[PDB]
Design an enzyme around this catalytic site. Structure first.
Site, PDB file in Angstrom:
ATOM      1  N   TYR A 109       0.844  -1.184   0.000  1.00  0.00           N
ATOM      2  CA  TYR A 109       0.000   0.000   0.000  1.00  0.00           C
ATOM      3  C   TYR A 109       0.899   1.262   0.000  1.00  0.00           C
ATOM      4  O   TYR A 109       1.901   1.351   0.720  1.00  0.00           O
ATOM      5  CB  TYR A 109      -0.885   0.029   1.238  1.00  0.00           C
ATOM      6  CG  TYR A 109      -1.782   1.229   1.284  1.00  0.00           C
ATOM      7  CD1 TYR A 109      -1.296   2.481   1.683  1.00  0.00           C
ATOM      8  CD2 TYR A 109      -3.117   1.114   0.911  1.00  0.00           C
ATOM      9  CE1 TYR A 109      -2.125   3.599   1.710  1.00  0.00           C
ATOM     10  CE2 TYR A 109      -3.943   2.205   0.925  1.00  0.00           C
ATOM     11  CZ  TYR A 109      -3.443   3.453   1.326  1.00  0.00           C
ATOM     12  OH  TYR A 109      -4.285   4.537   1.306  1.00  0.00           O
ATOM     13  N   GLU A 197      -4.008   6.935  -3.553  1.00  0.00           N
ATOM     14  CA  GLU A 197      -4.027   5.644  -2.948  1.00  0.00           C
ATOM     15  C   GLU A 197      -3.722   4.608  -4.026  1.00  0.00           C
ATOM     16  O   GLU A 197      -4.440   4.492  -5.024  1.00  0.00           O
ATOM     17  CB  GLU A 197      -5.374   5.343  -2.298  1.00  0.00           C
ATOM     18  CG  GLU A 197      -5.519   3.886  -1.985  1.00  0.00           C
ATOM     19  CD  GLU A 197      -6.732   3.614  -1.087  1.00  0.00           C
ATOM     20  OE1 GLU A 197      -6.709   3.987   0.128  1.00  0.00           O
ATOM     21  OE2 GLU A 197      -7.719   3.026  -1.628  1.00  0.00           O
TER      22      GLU A 197
END
Ligand SMILES: CC(C)(COP(=O)(O)OP(=O)(O)OC[C@H]1O[C@@H](n2cnc3c(N)ncnc32)[C@H](O)[C@@H]1OP(=O)(O)O)[C@@H](O)C(=O)NCCC(=O)NCCS
Ligand SMILES: CC(C)(COP(=O)(O)OP(=O)(O)OC[C@H]1O[C@@H](n2cnc3c(N)ncnc32)[C@H](O)[C@@H]1OP(=O)(O)O)[C@@H](O)C(=O)NCCC(=O)NCCS
Lengths: 388, 287, 388, 287
Positions: A109, A197
């Site tokens: 991530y 993101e």
């Protein structure tokens, strides 16, 4: 404003960041034809909607035949995709992203937001890719690594390396990760993003970093200087009333309830919604008039609030503003007549000519109650939807 | 009182524009010592009977103003604010809504390093009832008093103003810190000023969803604020991840809900009120 | 490193800043042909050399015929232009800039440097264009306006306006000036300039700002990340020995005198020059060995210092370094033989094996004196050029 | 002594590189408490018997080092320096030559705001004879003593070191502020440390052409330095507008000549010496 995943990836490509080979297609024919431009299957086909959770909703599939790509595009194009991040009405799928399959070795991530507590663009990374980042922050905070962009210096390579090493990357993956951080940080600042993101930022079996997904959010306040981003707005992804409200200088957000709220002031709007909730009511919407509650504007406000069939009453709470309370009342009256407002309307006016505006409301004969104070206004709208 | 008082000399940036003109007229009628304005290109003219300057430095040299109120459209604010900071202005009240978060991110850093205080942006302004009015708030609902008010919202502040004027407490100073995600000043900064202000006997802190300024303010109040504080947080019924009007009224990453803020305040000893209509009652209680 | 005026103007054009229509020409034929591409005369023809003061040296003329342009190019191309800012040898003219005449209404000055006292890029402007800016600072300081670029925010429009208004510009000239400031500031930062000077920045009779001249200096330490600038280096504009020295890791600056100085350390080099001057000598050069005084390097140093016929003696002052004093002596000895150093050489060695290195020098039999300390070394080199 | 002493724990950035290795060996032999180094990519290895870390933060967490010496090539220095500042390092000694002036312009601002002290760049380093050596200076010419030395030049400093060791005065601490136009620390910063240092009884200030640090240092000395100061400025015979080796050794705009610096120092009461060979003599005089 949100961007589609395919647009996020185009931006990434424009900044030399890595994303799978892919094409955004608007017809099943385009989607099936993309397969061959991409090469050897299998191919990943993804509905393009702003909301996440597309995978669990069936909007992301790995298929191995042109016929499957087509079947998938046919199934979704023009259909609305409901995910756990959209309302039950979902978001229209007008593009299917067809990209090359990626051999995933590991999912990471990498993301960034403006952290209000530290007042910095903060990048965060985690070895826990493929998971809701919030989930990981709750449970395994020690696995979330962060760096704050220094406004004085701009993003620095050591910050990218710092995250890379905390993620335990090594060798070429460190430089690749650093490069991705520097580019995403640069995009963040140059494009006035509010959010980035990459979930997942993938380490491929072949040993490379690749952005498998991309979720970008632009600071809407900066769109005046982001012409490219400005053009990427997809209004189909949001309740069309929001844009309608906005072009009329109204901030509208549809809610679940049945008591429409028309208030001047974001804070007052939320507080009004809360007070309606506090007195047993169910706010149907947030509508901040902000702009001068003129007759025309109040009319639009009603049109917008009433486009929701669930609305059984409208609470108008106006405290101050640029228009005198009696002119506001004349406009509420004109709005109710001209819009054919078939529901009871409770009004709380405060400011110059408050009582005269109230009198005007009481004398119109329209189903408009001029309340005496806020608590009273709440109880009365709450009472006005009883049984309805 | 805090920030401003009868002696604060104020210049207005964006002075000749619609809002700058209109609100300066109001400040002028209220008795605020507006001493001039700045509109690049209109220097050397007079507006509302005051001198207009091409730059803030000319305005400051000419008038000695220590505060500037800004009514400059969002695209030019960063420039206006940095110009004011550079000209020596010590207090900047920025009314402008729509300033890019990144612009404020940089401005906030500049403000803090230059030791310049800014209220806003996206703020209704600041008012010390009976002494000084800078901003867009309606001055007639205020009453020179003892309640200091800090709020991320203009309209909600007015409600608290009405209530505290109606209960006769009145206001020492009302500070709208604005609804942006990165304001020039936060709750803690203003709370500290109220604690240190003799005229302020009680504080009404008004927040809303988003960010964690209220939660931090709570922790701060518990440890450093001795005066009674009444709190109200709007947005209990707001959805998450949706901007509710104010750029800063958005619950990001499921953190910063109204309930969490109420809870954090309650745990710090702040007298919270669930209905915005009961701020006056709660003050009566703690007063 | 300095750029030619035509290169500065190309850069300006690349940044949307205004400069006259012009062409850099390497042949009289190109220069004469440029006249018609430019249009109606008259035309300004300017020798392109790094040094300023070209006007007073005859290198800038306003001509009105293609034949005059050609005559001018023929006169200067391949000839060296001597100005009050070059040595008596001048700078080769390999380009003639042929540009459109400009109708000057007023001459201003706009420039920027890194101010070391305030540690900021400082832009300065003055209504006193067409004059040596230093002259104006001496006499009319109150006419020089300055703004410092804030590293945290980058250049801001208000700074451009500030200077514009102090210059008494008004109307469109303010925006034009602001635009020029923002662009020059941006170029300064993006291209790692050390210096910008637009003298004159002209207000045309038609009411527009235009860069009539441009003098840009790049931070040589940043050339590794300025590939475009790197290619613009014109080595013909400098003493070729400097580049020779540099590729050998030597910093060389030719002076007037006759006592060559070879020292390790910029500070020691200047101090050595000063001490030679203090003892009646005339330093012929600054040569900082910096790099390990190896045999090969010392040899190059001698070759470079001795390429100046005026050199009658060479003082070598080595204090420390990475090479032991005896190895330095072996190299000085090899250098003197292999270079065929026909002049006396005085050496001051300090550090490990200083006396053994001295002994080696004394025993070589070459005309190399090993001095005992610096004062002594100075007196001896001074004495070694007596009569020569 | 100032800046460093026997207790200073030092890490080296660019530790495994040629110069970082070589000079760390020298620092190690001198007794400097080198406790580790940082070379991105070689973390977890050992070099010169010390741990190598991938980042300065790992190095600081592991060793507690408060000082970092940097031997990182110019292109990566800004990054190295900001990394050190970010990791909590309080003293940075940057040896690297060639750092873009603009990089240092930003670094200097960061250093000052973060309260981090940097000596350099383009510096020979810092040495407190008998206690701590960080840098490239030859440690054997030094002698634990009472003369504090600050200089924009390495080699000239050595001369002053030799002289003060030969006259038996010895050195408290020698600080090479470096030859760049925007150093991390200037004369005034170091002068102030010497004035406040009991072990330093006299100061040798060595400057050269360019900038105005010496002229400002003069004004500073006159008003705030009571200890005797001997000054030497190189470049009396340097041409104007020509870089003399050091990026900062250039007389820009005809200002900053050696004579102007001598003059400014002389006028502030500094004992100046025209020949670099007489620094020791002049100290003897004022001692
Ligand atoms: C700032 C704001 C009020 C400006 O609106 P406005 O007055 O209609 O804008 P105008 O264009 O009429 O006037 C702006 C003036 O700023 C000037 N201006 C622009 N850049 C400037 C600068 N750097 N310095 C000074 N003045 C500047 C313009 O010249 C213009 O004046 P002019 O008409 O004399 O040329 C508006 O953009 C806004 O932000 N509104 C929201 C306020 C708010 O809701 N606050 C929250 C409390 S609920
Ligand atoms: C800094 C300087 C000494 C470096 O030279 P060098 O040691 O030969 O350079 P090297 O490439 O051998 O070593 C540099 C190391 O820094 C490392 N490095 C690069 N970026 C880094 C970073 N951000 N953090 C830490 N180390 C880093 C490299 O990994 C390299 O080590 P490696 O070989 O183990 O990979 C040289 O560039 C210099 O500036 N010299 C002039 C010094 C001077 O003259 N001072 C003035 C007093 S007179």
């Amino acid at each position: 404003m949100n961007l589609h995943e395919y647009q996020a990836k185009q931006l990434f490509a424009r900044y030399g960041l890595p994303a799978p080979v892919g094409y955004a297609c608007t017809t099943p024919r385009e989607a099936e034809e993309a397969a061959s431009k991409i090469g050897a299957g299998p191919w990943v086909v993804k509905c393009q909607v702003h909301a996440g959770g597309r995978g669990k909703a069936g909007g992301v599939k790995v298929v191995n035949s042109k016929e499957d790509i087509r079947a998938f595009a046919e199934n979704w194009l023009g259909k609305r995709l409901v995910t756990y991040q959209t309302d039950a009405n979902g978001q229209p799928v007008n593009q299917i992203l067809v990209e090359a399959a990626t051999d995933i070795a590991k999912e990471l991530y990498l993301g960034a937001v403006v952290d209000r507590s530290s007042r910095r663009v903060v990048f965060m990374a985690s070895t826990e890719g493929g998971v809701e980042i919030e989930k990981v922050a709750e449970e395994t905070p020690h696995l979330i690594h962060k760096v704050a962009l220094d406004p004085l210096t701009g993003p620095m390579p050591y910050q990218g390396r710092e995250l890379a090493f905390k993620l335990g990357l090594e060798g070429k993956l460190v430089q690749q990760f650093t490069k991705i951080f520097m580019g995403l940080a640069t995009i963040f600042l140059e494009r006035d993003l509010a959010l980035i993101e990459i979930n997942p930022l993938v380490i491929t079996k072949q040993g490379d970093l690749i952005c498998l997904d991309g979720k970008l959010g632009a600071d809407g306040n900066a769109l005046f200087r982001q012409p490219d981003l400005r053009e990427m707005r997809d209004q189909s992804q949001e309740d069309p009333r929001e844009a309608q409200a906005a072009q009329w200088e109204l901030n509208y957000v549809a809610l679940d309830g049945n008591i429409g709220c028309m208030v001047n002031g974001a804070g007052l709007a939320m507080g009004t919604m809360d007070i309606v909730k506090l007195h047993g009511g169910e706010p149907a919407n947030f509508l901040d008039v902000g702009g001068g509650a003129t007759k025309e504007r109040v009319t639009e406000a009603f049109k917008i609030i009433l486009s929701d069939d669930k609305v059984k009453a409208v609470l108008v709470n106006i405290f101050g503003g640029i228009v005198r309370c009696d002119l506001i009342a004349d406009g509420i009256i004109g709005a109710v007549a001209e819009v054919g407002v078939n529901v009871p309307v409770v009004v709380r006016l405060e400011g110059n000519n408050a009582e005269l505006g109230a009198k005007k409301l009481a004398d119109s004969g329209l189903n408009i109650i001029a309340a005496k104070g806020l608590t009273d206004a709440a109880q009365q709208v709450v009472a006005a939807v009883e049984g309805k | 009182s805090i920030l401003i008082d009868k002696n604060t000399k104020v210049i207005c940036q964006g002075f000749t524009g619609s809002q700058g003109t209109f609100h300066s007229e109001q400040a002028i009628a209220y008795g605020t010592k507006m001493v001039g304005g700045v509109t690049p290109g209109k220097g050397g003219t007079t507006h509302l009977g005051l001198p207009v300057f091409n730059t803030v430095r000319e305005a400051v040299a000419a008038t000695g103003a220590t505060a500037s109120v800004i009514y400059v459209p969002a695209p030019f604010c960063k420039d206006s604010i940095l110009e004011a900071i550079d000209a020596g202005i010590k207090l900047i009240i920025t009314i402008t809504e729509g300033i890019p978060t990144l612009d404020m991110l940089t401005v906030k850093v500049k403000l803090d390093e230059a030791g310049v205080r800014m209220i806003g942006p996206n703020s209704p302004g600041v008012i010390t009832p009976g002494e000084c009015k800078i901003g867009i708030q309606p001055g007639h609902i205020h009453k020179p008093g003892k309640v200091g008010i800090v709020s991320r919202s203009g309209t909600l502040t007015y409600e608290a103003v009405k209530q505290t004027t109606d209960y006769g407490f009145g206001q020492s100073t009302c500070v709208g810190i604005g609804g942006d995600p990165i304001p020039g000043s936060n709750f803690i900064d203003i709370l500290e000023m109220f604690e240190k202000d003799p005229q302020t006997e009680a504080i009404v802190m008004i927040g809303e969803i988003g960010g964690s300024a209220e939660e931090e303010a709570a922790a701060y109040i518990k440890e450093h604020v001795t005066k009674p504080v009444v709190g109200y947080i709007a947005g209990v019924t707001a959805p998450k991840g949706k901007r509710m009007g104010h750029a800063g009224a958005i619950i990001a990453g499921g953190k910063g809900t109204a309930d969490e803020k109420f809870a954090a305040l309650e745990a710090a000893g702040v007298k919270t009120v669930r209905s915005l209509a009961d701020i006056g009652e709660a003050l009566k209680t703690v007063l």
